[PDB]
Design an enzyme around this catalytic site. Structure first.
Site, PDB file in Angstrom:
ATOM      1  N   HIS A   1       0.855  -1.216   0.000  1.00  0.00           N
ATOM      2  CA  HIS A   1       0.000   0.000   0.000  1.00  0.00           C
ATOM      3  C   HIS A   1       0.865   1.231   0.000  1.00  0.00           C
ATOM      4  O   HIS A   1       0.861   1.996   0.952  1.00  0.00           O
ATOM      5  CB  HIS A   1      -0.999  -0.021   1.133  1.00  0.00           C
ATOM      6  CG  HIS A   1      -2.109  -1.016   0.931  1.00  0.00           C
ATOM      7  ND1 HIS A   1      -2.129  -2.232   1.572  1.00  0.00           N
ATOM      8  CD2 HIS A   1      -3.217  -0.983   0.146  1.00  0.00           C
ATOM      9  CE1 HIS A   1      -3.212  -2.906   1.199  1.00  0.00           C
ATOM     10  NE2 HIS A   1      -3.870  -2.183   0.318  1.00  0.00           N
TER      11      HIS A   1
ATOM     12  N   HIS B   1       1.900   1.648  -5.655  1.00  0.00           N
ATOM     13  CA  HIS B   1       0.461   1.284  -5.834  1.00  0.00           C
ATOM     14  C   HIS B   1      -0.352   2.566  -6.177  1.00  0.00           C
ATOM     15  O   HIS B   1      -1.177   2.548  -7.089  1.00  0.00           O
ATOM     16  CB  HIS B   1      -0.010   0.663  -4.532  1.00  0.00           C
ATOM     17  CG  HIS B   1      -1.494   0.528  -4.437  1.00  0.00           C
ATOM     18  ND1 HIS B   1      -2.179  -0.365  -5.235  1.00  0.00           N
ATOM     19  CD2 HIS B   1      -2.417   1.102  -3.627  1.00  0.00           C
ATOM     20  CE1 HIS B   1      -3.458  -0.325  -4.938  1.00  0.00           C
ATOM     21  NE2 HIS B   1      -3.645   0.570  -3.991  1.00  0.00           N
TER      22      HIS B   1
ATOM     23  N   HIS C   1      -5.479   7.847  -2.701  1.00  0.00           N
ATOM     24  CA  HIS C   1      -6.464   7.013  -2.055  1.00  0.00           C
ATOM     25  C   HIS C   1      -5.980   6.070  -0.959  1.00  0.00           C
ATOM     26  O   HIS C   1      -6.816   5.591  -0.181  1.00  0.00           O
ATOM     27  CB  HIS C   1      -7.202   6.198  -3.093  1.00  0.00           C
ATOM     28  CG  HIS C   1      -6.475   4.948  -3.429  1.00  0.00           C
ATOM     29  ND1 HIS C   1      -5.393   4.924  -4.286  1.00  0.00           N
ATOM     30  CD2 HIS C   1      -6.575   3.707  -2.900  1.00  0.00           C
ATOM     31  CE1 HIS C   1      -4.910   3.698  -4.321  1.00  0.00           C
ATOM     32  NE2 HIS C   1      -5.612   2.946  -3.490  1.00  0.00           N
ATOM     33  N   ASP C   2      -4.650   5.838  -0.844  1.00  0.00           N
ATOM     34  CA  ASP C   2      -4.123   4.973   0.244  1.00  0.00           C
ATOM     35  C   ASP C   2      -3.152   5.774   1.109  1.00  0.00           C
ATOM     36  O   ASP C   2      -2.324   5.177   1.777  1.00  0.00           O
ATOM     37  CB  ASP C   2      -3.456   3.673  -0.277  1.00  0.00           C
ATOM     38  CG  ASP C   2      -4.465   2.509  -0.421  1.00  0.00           C
ATOM     39  OD1 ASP C   2      -5.380   2.496   0.438  1.00  0.00           O
ATOM     40  OD2 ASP C   2      -4.325   1.637  -1.370  1.00  0.00           O
TER      41      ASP C   2
ATOM     42  N   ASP D   1      -8.180   0.345  -8.259  1.00  0.00           N
ATOM     43  CA  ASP D   1      -7.542  -0.208  -7.083  1.00  0.00           C
ATOM     44  C   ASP D   1      -7.072  -1.646  -7.302  1.00  0.00           C
ATOM     45  O   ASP D   1      -6.000  -2.034  -6.838  1.00  0.00           O
ATOM     46  CB  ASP D   1      -8.518  -0.153  -5.898  1.00  0.00           C
ATOM     47  CG  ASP D   1      -7.825  -0.089  -4.538  1.00  0.00           C
ATOM     48  OD1 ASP D   1      -8.566  -0.289  -3.548  1.00  0.00           O
ATOM     49  OD2 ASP D   1      -6.573   0.143  -4.417  1.00  0.00           O
TER      50      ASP D   1
ATOM     51  N   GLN E   1      -6.644 -17.017  -4.214  1.00  0.00           N
ATOM     52  CA  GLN E   1      -6.688 -16.168  -5.414  1.00  0.00           C
ATOM     53  C   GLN E   1      -7.890 -16.503  -6.261  1.00  0.00           C
ATOM     54  O   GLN E   1      -8.615 -15.598  -6.705  1.00  0.00           O
ATOM     55  CB  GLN E   1      -5.420 -16.302  -6.225  1.00  0.00           C
ATOM     56  CG  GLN E   1      -4.234 -15.628  -5.527  1.00  0.00           C
ATOM     57  CD  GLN E   1      -4.433 -14.137  -5.395  1.00  0.00           C
ATOM     58  OE1 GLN E   1      -4.553 -13.438  -6.395  1.00  0.00           O
ATOM     59  NE2 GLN E   1      -4.484 -13.633  -4.145  1.00  0.00           N
TER      60      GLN E   1
END
Ligand SMILES: O=[N+]([O-])c1cccc2ncccc12
Ligand code: NI
Ligand code: NI
Length: 332
Positions: free
Chosen positions: A80, A84, A118-119, A229, A281
């Site tokens: 994060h 990213h 956003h993070d 995202d 996953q």
């Protein structure tokens, strides 16, 4: 502790940066991987803002200070992080370029900024963790805990002297853009994705979806934010696989802290359960990623390459489960 601020050398350097001509073409494509170009990431963001919004959308100095201060308020965590941030912003750029006139100039500038931010100040812990151990942030923000903090960090950076890229907007447009960014950031809370996607699929299949309706627009924008995202799952396989290593590094670190607090983590977060990763996953792609890009392609046809790529990666995880993996390289 406090908000970090870039150096004069940092933002002035970004101001004179020039993107290599060959990347111009590449940056337009969904599958583009910023990975091999670390020194260029901030310059890549300037380029995308200039191409989408115009070289006069923001004052260049305020923009360069904003960008380099945004970078400095991402922590050195495995996933994060600043990388990213730029990856997600690049995905939004590709979506916007392919759907340009569906969105207002205010939306495009707000979304590109929302994606970069956003993070902000992510610590490598999930909402699940913060709420379980009553971190101060969960007291302050009862739902969408990290996302409300990321928005608050965005606003703090805008408030630094010389960093308010939105100051020249009319007061009405200023308030509208801060709302665009807030909604967009909150929307990156995956807990909200499930409801949003189900609602959109419903509006689409009955034909009530109407982009002239503000609540509809907000929801389509929310799904765009999810799509961006998650976009590591839409890259070429080797890139997706390498990024998964980074994601799991944070997960396993969180799991380790839980074990210290007397609680066994979920298997996804257990470094002693790596055998379960390929199935995890599969679960993630089937439950979240495939439906996301599926609905996004219905609503915005040009985003179809995100869905095609996501499908190819699901196929690769299925190969892994059946024991068909070939040689793989990691950066450890
Ligand atoms: O939340 N993610 O970003 C994410 C990306 C890729 C795989 C994942 N698997 C499980 C949970 C989250 C995942
Ligand atoms: Ni997040
Ligand atoms: Ni994110």
């Amino acid at each position: 502790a406090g908000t970090s601020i870039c150096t004069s050398e940092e933002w002035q350097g970004l101001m004179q940066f020039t993107l290599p001509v060959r990347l111009c073409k590449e940056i337009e494509l969904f599958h583009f991987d910023i990975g091999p170009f670390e020194n260029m990431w901030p310059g890549i963001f300037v380029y995308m803002v200039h191409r989408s919004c115009g070289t006069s959308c923001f004052e260049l100095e305020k923009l360069c200070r904003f960008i380099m201060s945004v970078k400095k308020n991402y922590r050195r965590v495995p996933y994060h992080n600043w990388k990213h941030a730029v990856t997600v912003a690049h995905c939004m750029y590709a979506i916007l370029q392919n759907n340009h006139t569906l969105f207002t100039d205010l939306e495009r500038k707000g979304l590109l900024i929302a994606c970069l931010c956003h993070d902000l100040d992510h610590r490598g812990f999930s909402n699940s963790y913060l709420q379980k151990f009553d971190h101060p942030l969960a007291a302050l923000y009862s739902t969408s805990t990290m996302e409300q903090h990321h928005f608050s960090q965005t606003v703090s950076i805008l408030q630094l002297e010389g960093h308010n890229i939105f100051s020249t907007l009319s007061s009405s447009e200023y308030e509208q853009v801060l709302e665009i960014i807030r909604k967009a950031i909150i929307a990156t809370d995956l807990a909200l994705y499930f409801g949003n996607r189900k609602q959109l699929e419903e509006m689409y299949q009955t034909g009530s979806l109407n982009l002239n309706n503000q609540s509809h627009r907000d929801r389509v924008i929310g799904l765009m934010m999810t799509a961006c995202d998650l976009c590591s799952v839409t890259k070429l396989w080797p890139v997706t696989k390498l990024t998964a290593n980074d994601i799991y590094a944070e997960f396993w670190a969180e799991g380790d802290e839980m074990k210290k607090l007397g609680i066994q983590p979920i298997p996804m977060m257990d470094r002693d359960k790596k055998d379960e990763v390929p199935q995890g996953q599969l679960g993630f792609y089937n439950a979240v990623a495939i439906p996301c890009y599926t609905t996004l392609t219905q609503i915005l046809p040009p985003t179809e390459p995100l869905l095609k790529a996501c499908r190819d990666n699901l196929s690769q995880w299925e190969k892994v489960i059946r024991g068909e993996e070939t040689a793989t390289w990691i950066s450890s």
